A = this chain, B = another copy of it.
Amino acid sequence: AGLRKMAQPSGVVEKCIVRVCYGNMALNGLWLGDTVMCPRHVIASTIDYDYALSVLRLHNFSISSGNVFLGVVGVTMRGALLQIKVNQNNVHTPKYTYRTVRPGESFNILACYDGAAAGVYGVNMRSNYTIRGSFINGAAGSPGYNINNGTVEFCYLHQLELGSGCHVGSDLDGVMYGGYEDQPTLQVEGASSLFTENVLAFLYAALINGSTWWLSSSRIAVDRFNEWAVHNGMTTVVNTDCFSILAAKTGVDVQRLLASIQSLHKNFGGKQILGYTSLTDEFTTGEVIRQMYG
C-alpha cells in the first residue's frame, strides 16, 4: 500500500557526471564514451554562441571526474548543448539511448553540483514544457533520465530557471523543451494546465488504496469533459485504453472519474487524497500500475 513519487535508482547515472569548467563558469557535464555533453552557456560571458565558440581555446576547459582531469580533444555545437570530445573513454558508460519526453511523461532528475550527484527525485513534464524541480545556481547540466530494461534513456539536461522559479532544460539533441531560449533575456512560461490523464491515474491509485470519499456518482463523456477542461486549467483526455486494467480492478470507469474531477474543482483543497492535493498530476498510468502491482 501507499503511493509515493519515486526516482529510479541513480547509481548507473552517477558515474557519468563530470564537472565542466570554462573561464569563470562552472557546471555539470554528462560523460558517455569519449564525449562530454554540457549546456553551451558554460562558454558565454544576448549571447552569440557561434562567436563565443569561434574565440574559444580548448586549453581553457577544465573537465574533471573526481580529481581526475580529462584531456579535451574537440568541441562542436549541438543546439543548446556542447558536444565535447575528450581523450578518455568512461569505462562506466552504461547501455544508453536518447529520447525526447512529451508533456505528461515522468522521468528522473539527478541534481548535480560541481560534477557530483547531490540529490535524486522524480518529475513530470508539464503542459508548458517546464518541470517543478528543485535547483540552485550550479545545477545546469543536471541530467534527466529513465531506466528501461537495462538501458538508460537520457531525456533532459538542465539549462535554466524562469522568473516563476520553474525549470527548463534541453533534450540530448540540444533542443530546448518548449523552445525557450538559453539567453539572459526575460521570458515568461506559457500557461500550465493540470495533466488530466495523470490525475486519472492518481484517482485510480486512490481507489485501490481505499480512498473513495471524493468518488462521484455522476458521469460525463470524455469530449464534453475536454470542452470544460480547456476553460478550467486542465488538459484534454486523449488516451483512455491504458486505464482498462485500472477500471477493471476498481469497478470505476473514466467517465465517473471525470465527473469526480469536476466536483473536486469546486471545493478545491477541502480534503486531501492519500495525503496529496486532490488534483495531483505527477503520477502517470505506468507509475501507478508499477507501484500498486509490480
Interfacial chain B residues near A294, Cβ < 8 Å: 113, 136, 138
Question: Are the C-beta atoms of B277 and A269 separated by less than 8 Å?
Answer: yes
Chain B proximity mask over A262-294: 1 for CB below 8 Å, otherwise 0: 000001111110011110000000000001111
- Say yes or no: B11 contacts A136, CB within 8 Å: no
State A143–B209 Cα separation when bound (angstroms): 23
Q: Indicate whether A2 sits within 8 Å of B120 (C-beta atoms), given known contacts A11-B14, A269-B268.
A: no
Known A165-B210, A269-B271; judge A7-B121 contact (CB<8 A).
Answer: yes
Question: In angstroms, how far is the closest chain B Cβ from the Cβ of A92?
Answer: 10
Indicate if the CB atoms of B3 and A134 lie closer than 8 Å.
Answer: yes
Check A167 for interface membership: any CB of B closer than 8 A. Answer: yes
User: When the two chains form their complex, are residues B278 and A269 in contact, meaning their CB atoms are under 8 A apart?
Assistant: yes
Cβ of A193 within 8 Å of any chain B Cβ, yes or no, is: no
Is B9 a contact partner of A165 (Cβ separation < 8 A)? no
Given A2-B165, A3-B134, CB of A8 within 8 Å of CB of B278: no
A291 partner residues in chain B, CB cutoff 8 A: 134, 136
Q: How far is the CA of A180 from the CA of B32 in the complex (A)?
A: 47
Quick one: CB contact mask for A1-23 with B, threshold 8 Å, 1 for yes? Answer: 11111111111101100000000
Contact A132 B269 (CB under 8 A): no
Complex CA–CA separation, A121 to B109 (angstroms)? 12
Is the pair B110, A9 in contact by a Cβ cutoff of 8 Å?
yes
Instruction: Please report which residues of chain A, range 100-159, place their CB below 8 angstroms from some CB of chain B when the two chains form the complex.
Output: 110-111, 113, 117-121, 132-136, 138
A120 and B269 form a contact (CB under 8 A): no
Complex CA distance for A6 and B14, rounded to whole angstroms: 15
A33 to B118, CA, bound (A): 26
Q: CA–CA, A189 to B2, complex, Å?
A: 15
- Give Cα distance in the complex from A218 to B121, angstroms: 36
Q: Please name all residues of chain B whose beta carbon is closer than 8 Å to the beta carbon of A272 when the two chains form the complex.
A: 269, 277-278
In the complex, the answer to whether A117 meets B9 with C-beta atoms within 8 Å is yes
Q: Is A197 an interface residue (CB 8 A)?
A: no
Contact of A133 among B4, B8, B10 (CB under 8 A): B4
Shortest Cβ distance from A205 into B: residue? B134
- With A113-B294, A277-B278 given, is the CB distance from A134 to B4 under 8 Å? yes
In the complex the two chains form, what is the Cα distance from A165 to B10 in whole Å? 27
Given contacts A9-B120, A269-B271, A278-B272, contact A4 B165 (CB under 8 A): no
Q: Mark A46-88, 1 if CB is under 8 A from B, else 0.
A: 0000000000000000000000000000000000000000000
**Complex CA–CA separation, A133 to B276 (angstroms):** 13
A7 & B4 in contact (Cβ 8 Å cutoff): no
Jot down 15 A-B pairs with beta carbons below 8 A, ordered by A: A2-B135, A3-B134, A4-B132, A4-B134, A6-B7, A6-B120, A6-B134, A8-B119, A9-B10, A10-B11, A113-B294, A136-B292, A269-B270, A276-B277, A277-B277
3 smallest beta-carbon distances between A and B, as pairs = A11-B11, A1-B165, A6-B119
